[PDB]
Amino acid sequence: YMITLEVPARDRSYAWLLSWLTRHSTRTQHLSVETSYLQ
Amino acid sequence: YMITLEVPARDRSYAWLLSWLTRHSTRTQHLSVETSYLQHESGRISTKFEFIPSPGNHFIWYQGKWIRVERNRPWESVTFTALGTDRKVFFNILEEARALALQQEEGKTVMYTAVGSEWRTFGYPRRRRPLDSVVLQQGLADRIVKDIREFIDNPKWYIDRGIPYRRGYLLYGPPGCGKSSFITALAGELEHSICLLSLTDSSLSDDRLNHLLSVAPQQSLVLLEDVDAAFLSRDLAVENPIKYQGLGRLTFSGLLNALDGVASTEARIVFMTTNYIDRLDPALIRPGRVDLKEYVGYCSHWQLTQMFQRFYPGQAPSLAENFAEHVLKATSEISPAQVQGYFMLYKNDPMGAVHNIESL
Amino acid sequence: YMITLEVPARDRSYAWLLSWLTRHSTRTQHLSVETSYLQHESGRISTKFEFIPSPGNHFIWYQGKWIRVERNRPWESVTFTALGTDRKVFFNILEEARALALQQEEGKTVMYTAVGSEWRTFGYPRRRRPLDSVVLQQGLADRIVKDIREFIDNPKWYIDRGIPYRRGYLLYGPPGCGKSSFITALAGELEHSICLLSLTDSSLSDDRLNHLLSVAPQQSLVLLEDVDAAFLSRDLAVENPIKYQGLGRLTFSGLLNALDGVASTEARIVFMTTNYIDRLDPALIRPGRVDLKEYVGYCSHWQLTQMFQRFYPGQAPSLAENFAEHVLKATSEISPAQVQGYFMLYKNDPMGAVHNIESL
Ligand SMILES: Nc1ncnc2c1ncn2[C@@H]1O[C@H](COP(=O)(O)OP(=O)(O)OP(=O)(O)O)[C@@H](O)[C@H]1O
Ligand SMILES: Nc1ncnc2c1ncn2[C@@H]1O[C@H](COP(=O)(O)OP(=O)(O)OP(=O)(O)O)[C@@H](O)[C@H]1O
Ligand SMILES: [Mg+2]
Ligand SMILES: [Mg+2]
């Protein structure tokens, strides 16, 4: 017995949740590289 | 041993059940986000996050029955599994869904659309436009209203003689005179629904057109916009058959037979609109397919006076006569839309629009 | 060791079994919703929730045999599994289905359609139009009725000489004269069924056309609407072969051979309709393919008098003569549809339509 909120791709707050998730990336065993360059 | 009611996507009460399910979203472990936003100012957007039940097996507690509802995932099939064999709770659910849905659609008009070969709703119900807000020529809206009401209220006379129970109207005129607005006002007045049909679609064929015209929702109007643009005719007709001139698998004979043929259904009202009356094939607008044809034109003295007294209520009657006289003296032909725009320039400024009438 | 009768989708008694199954829906754990609506007024729509058996393994208790019926899910195959080897229950089920279905189709006409390469029903059975409600020229409906009856009642004479047992009729005239209405009335009178066929379909080929013409239901009519629009001809025929001029994998030679060739079937009646008699290739309307051709035209004195006495029963005969004289003096040609519309304007108002006859 839990709660499973489902937010698919077609949502207005999709970008907001993605930004928050990038903000809260600490304590995450799986990662993706976020390197940027400035010559 | 249970009862498994199955309601697929192709159902009339599909929206009613969906609305009831959103109403009864409590006690549902699986959810979907239902947030909406209303901007006010200063970057302060109101949040309205709620819970649409997700397409899952949420257990409902309606009447203490532990009813299980499952929506699959493009093909959709809603399921209402219950216990034993009663069938009464299904009746109660359908009745409550009807009571909730019809309550929402009160004072509004529902707009349908053609998806595949079926009608589906298109957005939220729209606010209805008051009939008196649309000003046409003297004694024109009344005639159409009376004719439609007479057609609706006399089904027995049609059957007793054998004529098919059908009707059709055509509106033509210069661009910007009130065709679509009058159609919307009439649909609001008659408490009907509008079904939008496009003849230039890339997924329309004769069989699909016949099926759509056969399965149209009851208490509804079928609207065909710009029938001329879907079939070049006249000068072509003197040499070769009518070409379709567009993208789509449709033919002139198919449309002619679908509008009024052997397989045509009964109790249907169809509206057609065009800007070039002379570009329509005579066989398309013959009686039986289009019973009443009316012409909406440019402004007149009475129309301008009524528009002035509508946009600036409380003004003396002489101002309307002055405005009409000046407008008709300064210009000969003028569309009502231009008058509406000119009035929109002078918001809440009577006696100001009666001076700056230079719109040549 | 049991008996597993298999009836796939392509069966004549498929509708009969479906109707019987909807009749015997009691004792069925799995269901499908069967609600229908009838609006009256004030947003009070009557509900008619019922139960179609869903495509499942519902156990039926016919004659205390625990018969199991399964319908799969677009390929469909209904199954009637039973116990032992008896075959009597199958015959009883088929007979009861025939008794129920033919009871429903009484006083109505069934309209078929071409789906793929097979005939399927198209909506509910339609009410038949009385023959006298359609008024044609003097001594025209009687001739066609007599010819069709003579063709039906004399199969022996055809066989004794080796002539193929086939017939075909063509109706041509100005738009709005009574072609489709007369066809419907004749089909109702003869207790036949109408099969609708379109030559401009996007899924029609010569082999499929031959198969459709070979498997047409018995006691039925085959209707071809607007055969001219499917093949431009005449002026083209003087230079190059007959092009098809449309969307579809069909050729002129294929249609010509299908209508009457080597593989053509027997005991078939075909009706064709057109508006331009001069746009048809002579080889298409030669005897053998079109045995009788008739022209339906504009109104005449007797036709107008009969129409008046039909729309306003109980009136004195002088009024019909007055109406006919005034109509024929005010205008030269007029279509019956226009007269019907003008009468529809003056509902239940005799002596009113005899005064406002200005319809030039
Ligand atoms: N007779 C009228 N009375 C009031 N407003 C009108 C009238 N005619 C047009 N308008 C207004 O003008 C605008 C366009 O009207 P509408 O779309 O009905 O014109 P139309 O004749 O349908 O034009 P089109 O042929 O381009 O569709 C709307 O704002 C509508 O309210
Ligand atoms: N002779 C007639 N008697 C009575 N009603 C008629 C007659 N001819 C036409 N009508 C009426 O006129 C309307 C159209 O008739 P119908 O569709 O049969 O004409 P049609 O000749 O087939 O036209 P089209 O060539 O466009 O198909 C219907 O309401 C029909 O009942
Ligand atoms: Mg418009
Ligand atoms: Mg016709």
Side-chain angles (χ1 to χ4, degrees), chain A, chain B residues 1-237 239-360, chain C residues 1-237 239-360:
Chain A
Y1 309 142
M2 63 318 305
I3 37 178
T4 68
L5 200 68
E6 311 303 324
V7 56
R10 173 43 281 139
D11 289 70
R12 147 78 272 201
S13 267
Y14 197 86
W16 294 5
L17 308 155
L18 286 191
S19 63
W20 180 107
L21 167 161
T22 54
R23 161 46 195 77
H24 276 76
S25 186
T26 73
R27 193 174 135 162
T28 50
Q29 37 185 4
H30 330 89
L31 294 184
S32 41
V33 51
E34 189 184 356
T35 176
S36 176
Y37 288 97
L38 264 207
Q39 39 84 25
Chain B
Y1 309 143
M2 66 320 302
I3 37 178
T4 67
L5 200 68
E6 311 303 325
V7 56
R10 172 43 251 146
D11 289 71
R12 146 78 272 201
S13 267
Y14 197 86
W16 295 5
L17 310 159
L18 286 192
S19 63
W20 180 107
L21 168 147
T22 54
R23 156 52 195 78
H24 276 75
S25 188
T26 72
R27 192 216 212 200
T28 51
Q29 37 185 4
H30 330 90
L31 294 183
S32 42
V33 51
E34 189 184 356
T35 176
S36 176
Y37 288 97
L38 267 207
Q39 39 84 25
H40 318 291
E41 46 190 355
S42 306
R44 288 181 298 183
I45 326 296
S46 178
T47 198
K48 325 157 203 171
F49 156 71
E50 272 100 47
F51 50 51
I52 305 147
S54 44
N57 276 262
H58 332 307
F59 278 52
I60 316 297
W61 197 238
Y62 188 87
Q63 283 178 336
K65 305 298 299 299
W66 218 5
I67 322 182
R68 315 158 191 165
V69 48
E70 154 64 25
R71 166 178 55 186
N72 64 338
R73 179 98 289 176
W75 334 108
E76 315 288 349
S77 311
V78 193
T79 295
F80 276 61
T81 318
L83 49 96
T85 45
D86 314 275
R87 318 281 179 67
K88 155 71 184 52
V89 80
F90 292 163
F91 152 81
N92 205 349
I93 292 316
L94 263 85
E95 283 336 283
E96 185 179 358
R98 177 161 93 73
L100 172 61
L102 268 282
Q103 221 303 298
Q104 278 276 301
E105 184 250 352
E106 168 127 353
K108 307 191 163 23
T109 73
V110 163
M111 311 252 177
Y112 296 102
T113 192
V115 173
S117 75
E118 194 38 64
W119 299 102
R120 306 292 173 75
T121 67
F122 183 60
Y124 329 88
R126 314 267 217 288
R127 199 195 312 111
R128 72 186 39 174
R129 186 190 187 130
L131 187 90
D132 52 301
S133 92
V134 183
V135 181
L136 286 188
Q137 298 187 3
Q138 208 162 2
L140 174 64
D142 162 62
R143 262 158 48 191
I144 297 182
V145 162
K146 182 171 65 168
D147 281 9
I148 274 189
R149 200 146 293 179
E150 173 156 55
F151 163 73
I152 290 190
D153 290 5
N154 279 2
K156 165 181 287 305
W157 186 90
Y158 275 68
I159 286 155
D160 277 0
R161 324 291 171 73
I163 314 106
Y165 192 56
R166 278 177 331 247
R167 210 144 183 72
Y169 305 82
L170 173 82
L171 292 192
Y172 67 104
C177 298
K179 291 160 303 183
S180 316
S181 49
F182 180 64
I183 291 194
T184 287
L186 191 47
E189 174 80 1
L190 293 163
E191 281 284 354
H192 277 70
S193 315
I194 309 183
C195 307
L196 276 304
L197 214 174
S198 168
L199 299 175
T200 70
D201 197 68
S202 47
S203 43
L204 200 92
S205 53
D206 302 0
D207 44 0
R208 302 177 79 116
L209 174 61
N210 219 351
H211 263 297
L212 273 178
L213 251 57
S214 76
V215 78
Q218 201 56 60
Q219 272 304 298
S220 156
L221 264 54
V222 178
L223 182 48
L224 290 173
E225 270 311 14
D226 283 23
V227 278
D228 48 358
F231 281 110
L232 85 173
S233 279
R234 296 324 294 284
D235 165 59
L236 205 80
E239 327 160 359
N240 48 309
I242 312 288
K243 299 180 48 60
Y244 159 85
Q245 191 238 299
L247 70 182
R249 324 211 320 281
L250 195 90
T251 53
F252 190 47
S253 51
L255 169 73
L256 273 191
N257 282 298
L259 280 195
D260 166 53
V262 182
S264 73
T265 51
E266 277 178 0
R268 172 178 47 112
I269 304 183
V270 172
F271 273 74
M272 308 174 20
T273 307
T274 179
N275 285 302
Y276 311 113
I277 187 76
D278 42 359
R279 291 189 197 175
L280 285 183
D281 191 289
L284 176 63
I285 61 175
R286 75 147 169 74
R289 276 173 179 113
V290 168
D291 306 9
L292 192 57
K293 50 161 51 65
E294 297 285 359
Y295 168 69
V296 291
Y298 292 123
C299 278
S300 58
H301 183 111
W302 185 81
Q303 215 165 351
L304 288 167
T305 280
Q306 227 59 51
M307 202 96 78
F308 183 79
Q309 294 173 354
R310 195 78 34 128
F311 269 50
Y312 300 132
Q315 294 300 293
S318 171
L319 269 73
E321 314 284 352
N322 270 0
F323 176 71
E325 287 267 358
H326 284 1
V327 164
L328 270 194
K329 189 195 62 189
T331 326
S332 281
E333 65 84 25
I334 179 182
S335 307
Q338 287 162 354
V339 172
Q340 169 180 289
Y342 170 67
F343 278 144
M344 255 180 317
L345 286 184
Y346 293 95
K347 294 208 180 188
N348 287 351
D349 202 0
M351 202 76 198
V354 197
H355 285 178
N356 319 138
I357 317 153
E358 304 322 298
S359 49
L360 303 100
Chain C
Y1 309 142
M2 64 320 301
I3 36 178
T4 68
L5 200 68
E6 311 302 325
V7 64
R10 173 43 280 139
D11 289 70
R12 147 78 273 201
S13 269
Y14 197 85
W16 295 5
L17 309 156
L18 286 191
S19 63
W20 180 108
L21 169 163
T22 54
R23 155 53 194 76
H24 275 76
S25 187
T26 72
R27 182 156 153 183
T28 47
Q29 37 185 4
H30 330 89
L31 294 184
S32 41
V33 51
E34 189 184 356
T35 176
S36 176
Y37 287 97
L38 258 206
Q39 39 84 25
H40 318 291
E41 46 189 356
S42 306
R44 288 181 298 183
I45 327 295
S46 177
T47 198
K48 324 156 203 171
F49 159 71
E50 273 99 47
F51 49 51
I52 304 148
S54 42
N57 276 262
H58 332 307
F59 277 52
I60 316 297
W61 196 238
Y62 188 86
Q63 282 178 336
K65 305 298 299 299
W66 219 6
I67 321 182
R68 315 158 191 165
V69 48
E70 154 64 25
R71 166 178 55 185
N72 65 338
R73 179 98 289 176
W75 340 122
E76 314 288 349
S77 310
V78 193
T79 295
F80 275 60
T81 317
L83 49 96
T85 46
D86 314 275
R87 318 282 177 67
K88 157 70 183 52
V89 289
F90 293 161
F91 152 98
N92 204 349
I93 292 316
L94 262 69
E95 284 336 283
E96 185 179 358
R98 178 161 93 73
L100 172 61
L102 268 282
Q103 221 304 297
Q104 277 276 301
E105 185 255 342
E106 168 126 353
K108 328 290 209 72
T109 72
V110 163
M111 312 253 177
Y112 296 101
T113 192
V115 173
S117 75
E118 194 38 64
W119 299 102
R120 306 292 173 75
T121 67
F122 182 61
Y124 329 89
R126 314 268 217 288
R127 199 195 312 112
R128 72 187 39 174
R129 186 189 186 130
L131 188 89
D132 50 300
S133 92
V134 184
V135 182
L136 286 189
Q137 298 187 2
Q138 208 162 3
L140 174 64
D142 162 62
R143 263 158 48 191
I144 298 182
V145 162
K146 181 171 66 168
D147 281 9
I148 270 177
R149 200 146 293 179
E150 174 156 55
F151 164 73
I152 290 190
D153 290 5
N154 280 2
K156 165 180 287 306
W157 185 89
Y158 275 68
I159 287 156
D160 279 0
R161 320 297 166 73
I163 323 164
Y165 191 56
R166 278 177 330 248
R167 210 144 183 73
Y169 305 83
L170 174 82
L171 292 193
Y172 67 104
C177 297
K179 292 160 304 183
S180 301
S181 49
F182 181 63
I183 291 193
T184 287
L186 192 47
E189 174 80 1
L190 293 163
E191 281 284 354
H192 277 71
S193 315
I194 309 183
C195 307
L196 276 304
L197 205 162
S198 168
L199 296 211
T200 67
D201 197 67
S202 47
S203 42
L204 224 65
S205 53
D206 302 359
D207 45 1
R208 302 177 79 116
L209 175 61
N210 220 351
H211 271 307
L212 275 178
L213 251 56
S214 76
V215 78
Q218 201 55 60
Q219 271 304 298
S220 157
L221 264 54
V222 178
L223 182 48
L224 295 175
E225 272 301 26
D226 282 88
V227 305
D228 47 358
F231 281 110
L232 85 173
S233 210
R234 295 323 294 285
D235 166 59
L236 206 79
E239 327 160 359
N240 49 309
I242 323 292
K243 299 180 47 59
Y244 163 90
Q245 191 238 298
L247 68 178
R249 315 209 319 286
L250 195 91
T251 54
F252 190 47
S253 166
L255 170 73
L256 274 193
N257 282 299
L259 279 195
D260 167 53
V262 181
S264 73
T265 51
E266 277 178 0
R268 172 177 47 111
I269 304 183
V270 173
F271 274 75
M272 317 167 30
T273 306
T274 179
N275 286 303
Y276 311 113
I277 186 75
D278 42 359
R279 291 188 197 174
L280 285 184
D281 191 290
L284 176 62
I285 61 174
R286 75 146 170 74
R289 277 173 179 113
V290 170
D291 304 10
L292 191 58
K293 50 161 50 65
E294 297 285 359
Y295 167 69
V296 291
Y298 293 122
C299 280
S300 57
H301 182 110
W302 185 81
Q303 216 165 352
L304 289 168
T305 280
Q306 227 59 52
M307 201 99 68
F308 184 78
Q309 294 173 354
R310 195 75 31 114
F311 269 48
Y312 300 132
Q315 294 300 293
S318 172
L319 269 73
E321 314 284 352
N322 270 0
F323 176 71
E325 287 267 358
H326 284 1
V327 166
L328 270 194
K329 189 195 61 189
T331 326
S332 280
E333 99 287 4
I334 196 180
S335 306
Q338 287 165 354
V339 170
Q340 167 180 290
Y342 169 67
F343 278 144
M344 260 183 320
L345 286 183
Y346 293 95
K347 295 208 180 189
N348 287 350
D349 202 0
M351 206 75 206
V354 182
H355 285 179
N356 319 137
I357 323 165
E358 304 322 298
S359 49
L360 303 100

